[PDB]
Design a protein around this nucleic acid. Structure first.
Ligand SMILES: [Zn+2]
Lengths: 150, 67, 153, 242, 177, 121, 286, 378
RNA sequence: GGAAACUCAAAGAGUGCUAUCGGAGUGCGC
């Protein structure tokens, strides 16, 4: 009888997560792009101004499907998120739901940082241990649990 | 002009090609490398090749009517 | 042993084989196997050394045949009643297990029955099980003729 | 502990083919295909069976074999069953391919490829002993020049040490692996990228797999035996990826 | 045109208070000023190149073409080291030494920026571990005495590589005029 | 096609053997053929170096079959006496090895050397 | 494999029209079984002709992009390539006719000084062509006479014209009033059909190469498939994530329509929305 | 346009006419790429139209080498010249779905009217015919694919390695592991000859203790009736007189006959076994001199064969370190440092004569001189 | 309570099995 308890991924400390070297990989998602636009900050230069390090953004196919699905009010968001500076993942699961796609994607790798803004996703991300989220705030970004913010 | 040079050329190509392919029917995958074995298999293919050439002489002497 | 004594090397296997050995349907298999084989080649030194090995190992088999025929004839000479009843290759194991012929004759019918499987006998006695019934006589020619528990009786 | 002469029970494991050897301290043990000769110097259990016959078993030293550490750390399912055909990208020498061979058994085959030469002659000198393996001494980056001699393997496995790991396994699996078939790769982080660290390079490699149509399903890290490698198990979908 | 990088700088002498000479490992012998980080004149391989290991003691094989192809051509030829270098103080000529047997005495030119092979003394088979010069005479005529210490081991480690006929001694040469 | 194929040229020779001398002064080096193969089949070996002019060449040619099986780079050097002078020892050592240690201050030069010789091979 | 061969930053402004050619040069053999040629005109006065390396075959073993650049006086609005003898026509301020051995336009073929929104050549009787200009006008031209030949004026501006690859004298015409007209050429007084089911501007149409189905794609976020012989919609595709389909094309297999939205994607669709693509057994096909 | 396909197989070359076509645009769909997997639809798509088997094993290896470097050969060019039609220039040129772009230009060079193609359509069509394998060929062969590909793989691997098949240590392994067991078997069966001939002549185990000359004189004297011929016993063996008068004074005797005849058969066959030992030991002496001469000269021939047998193979002995050549019994303070010296010199000689291509004796001799100087240091 | 499946019926899974006027001539097609 096969039980399955996932081991704590061995590039993690107690909660320090030494696998997050300063060239970062972030996970952009949908209402974070929308709030970045309606707070009028940029994306790559905004992340650089918040983290003082070179950040590579990533968007998944599930989040791109959500951004296409949300209609023509966010054509600015879609034109911004088809940026050649960002990269793109490729998901393989059923149901384009950004929340469980994101939190599954990060809890089986523990190396991405999650750039989110909605309440349930922030709650699940800060529930699971040792991955940093960032969010919009005022006219800049804000990091929640990176060990070296400065 | 139209002598048996056709039959003689195809006899020559028969001799060298049947010798080579009898050697490659033996020595299956690995070219066997010892002096007396190579020499004795060359004697074996000389024996089989001349056993073919004597059959050529036999059912040509039955044919002859020519040069 | 006879096919290594006949072939020698695998290269000579295409133009010859005996038909007194490997009857009529393993012949083309061993010829195509010697055609497409994956082992290497050996020279005449180790060839004739393993040839002499094949000589000794075919002489062992012919001598074993001659010696078992000798054992049949000699048991028929010494104790012809027992080998007329049971069989020579069972009476020989009986006598040579019990030692002397006299010290096998001085033994009851029950232990002549169970003379072989005594270890299953004694572990079945010292635990609580049921003792066996054939032992060494099971390879005789008649308890194989019987069927069921008729071989026990 | 586990000296030569103790009596060890041989219990079967979940992955059919391998066995647990439970003594006073446990071992992982595969049933030897050619009895009587160890291949890289490992210890051998030797059981007797009843005409008395005697069959032997080899231990599986996880500090010197790759997938043994994944087996002992506990993978959900491999694809190396006792009947399948198994391709082995980056077969170094006998030291793991003999274990995969005698897991596979006398019916299935193991096609072991290798690029270097001196491990190639060691692999061939081992390969003459047991018959269920095929040694190939060709580069794993060119699966169109040993396409002549293999066909339609049922699970591939990968230990090659090159930074085009995903391209190697993608080309070999498109050329040879059947649909709904397994692919077990073993990434070495410090080998394929020295700059960025282990979890980032693992996520980049598994993203390259799910771009090359292998749907991954297991990631194990095998940390107490080797450092910073990982075993990534995947299926080859090709039809209905999601 | 077969040359190679510098391995080690080994021995020195000050010709004057504004130049000096270094005899390196790889056969380079270098005249330096006190003004430049670069050397002025780096003469190449000093005493020649060592003779290669022969075609019978390189690979233990039998066939001569295999034991000659294991020499890999000239690609493992190694230079004679400068074992000891010594200049006569405030003069033109300096003396080197190796286990090539021959004390090669160069001479610098009057513009103090080059030197050429003046002479070669083929008298001391062995490693030349240090070289001294003691002179006599008058203001005009000078009778110099090149002493050198000659051994069968280098003065730091053992490192005997192809030494033949080399006994522990003192090499004297009474050069004149 | 000789038996000592990855033979290093001059500048790469000089940088790998000053890394050798730094390792010998940092107590991170194993000197000699049989200690080299012992640390090689123990596993702690960043890379191993042989000398391509030992008078039997096979007494260190046995090291390729171990090292390229256990996936560790290996380099021939054209002088055993220069490698002895590099290791800082009287007699000429012909086969050196650098142990693995993440508490040693030549990790950067070791990795630069290892990348250069993996590109060389 | 649904992937891209190469990309190009082709121009600066809006790209306007591209088509592919097998362009027969005269000082060069047509190497059209190893590399494939496409050319594209934009509104920054350039018409670039490009090669593409393509592994359709494996004959050979390098001249990747930008074979040449025709440059024009005014802007450019569309092209299409005459499929014989390596000639191609463009539209802009007035329609021009180039071939790929000249940097200058070989001919100029307008009625008056009026811009031309789109063009199309035939699929047979190749030497004639049609175009549409923002005088709400359909023009025809004939290169054999090297002149325009007739001109009708509709009530709204024709966006995209498309010839029939089996009739050779019928074309469809997609204009901003919400109905694709279907004209016969040699009697241009009566639009012999009108396909009349949209709600917004009819942005593009194309014939299937089987010669009887029309794909159309509207300015409203929907595409429709018509038959020729009916005049109403057979059926309709739409999705939530496409907006303002601007270009639809049948594929040459005549089963797959390639639609391209304004969101960025180039989606594909089965024309028959229920016929699958596997080869089927004979009782199933029956 | 894919209408002919070429597949290469380890029994022969196959060429398939493509009856109908695959869906090109939807060629990533599930309902298309399961048709390659199932069989009832693949034979709707590909039929066999030619299959020429190369029949020579070496010609199969040569075809495999020419394909593996990407070059045409005689049988491939022969079947393409047979099967591929001359597509005349009015229609088209014929197309051929081959497996690799390295092979492509070498058939386009030879046949002008063919045109090779390998996109993913040719890739997965060849993948489908590789998956279905034998069930396409509908019986046009004699022999399955896997044993033939096993042989062809081993041959191709050895031809790539150019592995020296004269460096044979397995012969010495089996030689010494047969030799010691055969000495034990000769000794046991000679004890049986002694214990069986004791019933006929029990004062022979005292006089003639050697097993081989015991068996040979048991072959000489059948029954105790010799009594006169003294001039043959020094040949077959002074003690002649002892065995002659003990052939009449002893008479601890059973007079049995047929068992004496089988004793004679057994004794002459055990003598044959002794002759076989006395030649096999000399055989592996000279084979030790041929295969491993430096270690032979250093340590001795049978001690060397014992040491390679303990190691398992000569390559395994060489890749052992020089401190783990500790073996008990062999290499027989001042009694231990000489054995350590002999140990790592034996490992040095093992490295020389294994990793050489074919070894010499000069390094074994100078190794012998070095260790003898180290012994005379005492 | 153990079930002989060889009395028969209703059903469920796994495995294997197939294709889509007659010869010339005569105006003739490359
Ligand atoms: Zn997703």
């Amino acid at each position: 009888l096969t039980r399955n308890i996932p081991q704590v991924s061995s590039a993690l400390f107690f909660q320090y997560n030494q696998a997050i070297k300063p060239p970062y990989q972030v996970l952009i998602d949908t209402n974070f792009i929308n709030f970045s636009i309606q707070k009028k900050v940029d994306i790559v230069r905004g992340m650089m101004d918040c983290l003082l390090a070179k950040c590579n953004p990533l968007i998944t196919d599930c989040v791109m499907a959500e951004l296409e699905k949300l209609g023509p009010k966010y054509r600015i968001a879609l034109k911004l998120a088809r940026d050649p500076r960002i990269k793109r993942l490729s998901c393989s699961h059923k149901g384009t739901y950004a929340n469980d796609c994101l939190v599954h994607r990060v809890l089986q790798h523990k190396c991405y940082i999650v750039a989110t803004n909605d309440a349930g996703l922030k709650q699940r991300i800060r529930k699971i241990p040792g991955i940093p989220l960032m969010s919009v705030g005022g006219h800049a970004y804000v990091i929640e649990k990176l060990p070296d913010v400065f | 002009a139209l002598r048996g040079d056709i039959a003689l050329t195809i006899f020559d190509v028969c001799m060298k090609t049947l010798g080579k392919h009898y050697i490659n029917k033996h020595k299956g995958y690995y070219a066997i490398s010892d002096s007396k074995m190579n020499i004795e298999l060359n004697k074996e293919t000389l024996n089989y090749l001349f056993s073919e050439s004597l059959r050529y002489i036999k059912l040509f002497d039955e044919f002859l009517d020519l040069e | 042993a006879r096919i290594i004594l006949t072939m020698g090397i695998r290269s000579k296997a295409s133009e010859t084989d005996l038909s007194e050995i490997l009857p009529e349907e393993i012949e083309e298999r061993v010829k195509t196997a010697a055609e497409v084989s994956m082992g290497t080649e050996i020279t005449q030194t180790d060839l004739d050394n393993i040839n002499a090995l094949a000589e000794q190992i075919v002489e062992f088999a012919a001598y074993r045949e001659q010696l078992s025929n000798y054992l049949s004839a000699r048991m028929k000479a010494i104790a012809p009643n027992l080998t007329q009843l049971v069989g020579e290759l069972v009476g020989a194991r009986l006598i040579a297990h019990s030692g002397s012929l006299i010290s096998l004759a001085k033994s009851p019918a029950s232990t002549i029955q169970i003379l072989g499987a005594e270890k299953a006998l004694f572990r079945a006695l010292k635990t609580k099980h049921d003792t066996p019934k054939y032992g060494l006589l099971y390879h005789a020619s008649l308890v194989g003729q019987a069927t069921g528990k008729n071989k026990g009786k | 502990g586990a000296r030569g002469g103790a009596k060890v029970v041989i219990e079967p494991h979940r992955h059919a083919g391998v066995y647990i050897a439970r003594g006073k301290e446990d071992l992982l043990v595969t049933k030897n295909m050619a009895p009587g000769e160890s291949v890289y110097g490992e210890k051998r259990i030797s059981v007797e069976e009843p005409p008395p016959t005697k069959v032997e078993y080899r231990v599986w030293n996880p500090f010197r074999s790759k997938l043994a550490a994944g087996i002992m750390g506990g993978l959900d399912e491999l694809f190396i069953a006792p009947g399948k055909k198994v391709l082995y990208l980056g077969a170094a020498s006998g030291t793991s391919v003999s274990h995969v061979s005698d897991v596979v058994g006398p019916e299935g085959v193991v096609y072991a490829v290798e690029f270097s030469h001196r491990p190639g002659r060691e692999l061939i000198s081992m390969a003459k002993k047991r018959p269920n393996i095929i040694p190939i001494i060709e580069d794993a980056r060119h699966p169109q020049k040993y396409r002549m001699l293999i066909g339609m393997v049922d699970c591939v496995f990968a230990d090659v040490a090159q930074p085009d790991q995903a391209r190697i396994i993608a080309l070999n699996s498109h050329m040879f692996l059947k649909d709904q078939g397994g692919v077990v790769i073993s990434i070495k982080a410090n080998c394929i990228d020295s700059t960025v660290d282990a979890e980032t390079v693992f996520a980049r490699e598994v993203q390259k797999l799910r771009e090359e149509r292998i749907k991954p399903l297991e990631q194990l890290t095998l940390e107490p035996y080797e450092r910073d490698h990982c075993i990534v198990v995947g299926r080859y979908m090709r039809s209905g990826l999601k | 045109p077969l040359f190679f990088c510098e391995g080690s700088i080994d021995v020195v002498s000050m010709v004057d208070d504004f130049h000096f000479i270094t005899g390196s490992d790889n056969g380079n012998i270098c005249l330096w000023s006190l003004a430049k980080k670069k050397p002025i004149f780096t003469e190449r391989i000093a005493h020649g190149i060592l003779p290669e290991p022969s075609f019978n003691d390189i690979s233990g094989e039998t066939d001569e073409e295999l034991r000659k192809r294991q020499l890999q051509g000239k690609k493992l030829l190694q230079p004679f080291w400068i074992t000891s270098l010594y200049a006569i103080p405030y003069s033109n000529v300096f003396i080197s030494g190796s286990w090539s047997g021959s004390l090669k005495v160069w001479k610098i030119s009057d513009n103090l920026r080059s030197f050429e092979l003046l002479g070669e003394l083929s008298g001391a088979k062995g490693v030349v571990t240090k070289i001294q010069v003691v002179e006599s005479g008058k203001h005009g005529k000078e009778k110099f005495r090149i002493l050198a210490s000659i051994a069968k081991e280098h003065r730091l480690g053992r490192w005997i590589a192809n030494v033949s006929g080399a006994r522990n001694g003192i090499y004297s040469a009474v050069i004149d005029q | 096609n000789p038996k000592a194929f990855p033979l290093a040229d001059a500048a790469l020779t000089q940088q790998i053997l000053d890394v050798v001398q730094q390792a010998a002064n940092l107590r991170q080096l194993k000197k000699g053929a049989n200690e080299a193969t012992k640390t090689l089949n123990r596993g702690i070996s960043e890379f191993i170096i042989m000398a391509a002019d030992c008078e039997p060449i096979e007494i260190l040619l046995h090291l390729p079959l171990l090292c390229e099986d256990k996936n560790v780079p290996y380099v021939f050097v054209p002088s055993r006496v220069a490698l002895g002078r590099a290791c800082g020892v009287s007699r000429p050592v012909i086969a050196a090895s650098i142990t693995t240690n993440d508490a040693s201050a030549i990790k950067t030069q070791i990795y630069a050397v290892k990348d250069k010789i993996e590109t060389l091979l | 494999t649904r992937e891209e061969f190469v990309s190009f930053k082709a121009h600066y402004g809006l790209v306007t029209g591209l088509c592919v050619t097998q362009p027969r040069f005269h000082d060069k053999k047509p190497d059209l079984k190893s590399q494939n040629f496409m050319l594209s005109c934009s509104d920054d006065k350039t018409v670039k002709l490009w090669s593409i390396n393509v592994d359709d075959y494996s004959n050979k073993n390098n001249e990747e992009g930008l074979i040449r650049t025709f440059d024009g006086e005014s802007a450019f609005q569309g092209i299409d390539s005459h499929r014989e003898n390596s000639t191609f026509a463009t539209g802009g301020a007035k329609i021009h006719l180039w071939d790929v051995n000249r940097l200058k336009p070989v001919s100029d073929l307008s009625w008056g000084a009026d811009n031309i929104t789109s063009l199309k050549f035939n699929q047979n009787e190749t030497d004639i062509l049609a175009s549409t200009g923002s005088d709400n006008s359909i023009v025809l031209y004939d290169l054999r006479t090297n002149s325009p030949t007739q001109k009708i004026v509709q009530t709204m501006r024709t966006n995209a014209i498309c010839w029939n690859p089996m009739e050779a004298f019928n074309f469809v015409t997609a204009n901003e009033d919400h109905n694709a007209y279907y004209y016969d050429m040699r009697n241009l007084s009566r639009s012999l059909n009108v396909f009349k089911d949209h709600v917004s501007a009819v942005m593009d149409v194309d014939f299937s190469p089987t010669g009887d189905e029309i794909v159309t794609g509207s300015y409203d976020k929907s595409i429709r498939i018509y038959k020729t012989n009916h005049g109403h919609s057979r059926e309709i595709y739409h999705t939530k994530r496409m907006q303002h389909v601007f270009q639809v094309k049948y594929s040459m297999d005549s089963k797959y329509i390639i639609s391209g939205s304004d969101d960025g994607n180039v989606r594909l669709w089965r024309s028959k929305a229920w016929e699958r693509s596997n080869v089927k057994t004979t009782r199933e096909k029956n | 346009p894919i209408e002919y396909l070429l597949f290469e197989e380890p029994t022969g070359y196959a060429v398939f006419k493509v009856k109908l076509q695959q869906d090109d645009i939807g060629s990533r769909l599930k309902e298309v790429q399961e048709q390659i997997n199932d069989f009832g639809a693949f034979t709707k798509l590909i039929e066999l139209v030619s299959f020429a088997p190369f029949k020579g094993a070496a010609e199969a290896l040569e075809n495999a080498n020419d394909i593996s470097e990407g070059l045409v050969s005689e049988s491939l060019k022969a079947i393409l010249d047979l099967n591929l039609p001359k597509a005349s220039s009015k229609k088209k040129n014929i197309t051929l779905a081959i497996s690799d772009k390295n092979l492509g230009p070498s058939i386009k060079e030879e046949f002008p009217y063919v045109d090779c193609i390998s996109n993913e359509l040719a890739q997965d069509l060849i993948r489908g015919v590789r998956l279905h394998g034998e069930k396409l060929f509908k019986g046009l062969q004699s022999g399955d694919l896997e044993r033939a590909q096993l042989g062809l793989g081993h041959a191709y691997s050895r031809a790539k390695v150019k592995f020296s098949v004269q460096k044979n240590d397995n012969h010495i392994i089996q030689a010494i592991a047969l030799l010691d067991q055969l000495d034990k078997d000769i000794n046991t069966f000679a004890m049986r000859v002694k214990e069986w001939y004791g019933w006929h002549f029990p004062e022979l185990a005292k006089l003639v203790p050697d097993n081989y000359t015991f068996a040979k004189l048991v072959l000489f004297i059948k029954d105790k009736a010799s009594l006169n011929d003294d001039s043959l016993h020094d040949l077959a063996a002074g003690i002649a007189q002892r065995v002659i008068d003990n052939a009449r004074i002893s008479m601890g005797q059973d007079i049995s006959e047929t068992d004496m005849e089988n004793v004679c058969v057994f004794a002459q066959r055990v003598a044959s076994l002794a002759d076989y030992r006395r030649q096999l030991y000399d055989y592996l002496c000279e084979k030790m001199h041929t295969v491993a001469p430096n270690l032979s000269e250093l340590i001795g021939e049978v001690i060397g064969a014992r040491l390679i047998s303990h190691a398992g193979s000569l390559t395994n002995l060489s890749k052992q370190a020089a401190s783990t050549v500790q073996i008990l019994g062999a290499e027989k303070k001042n009694k231990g440092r000489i054995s350590r010296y002999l140990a790592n010199k034996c490992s040095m000689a093992s490295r020389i004569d294994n990793y050489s291509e074919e070894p010499s004796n000069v390094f074994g001799s100078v190794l012998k001189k070095q260790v003898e100087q180290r012994l005379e240091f005492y």
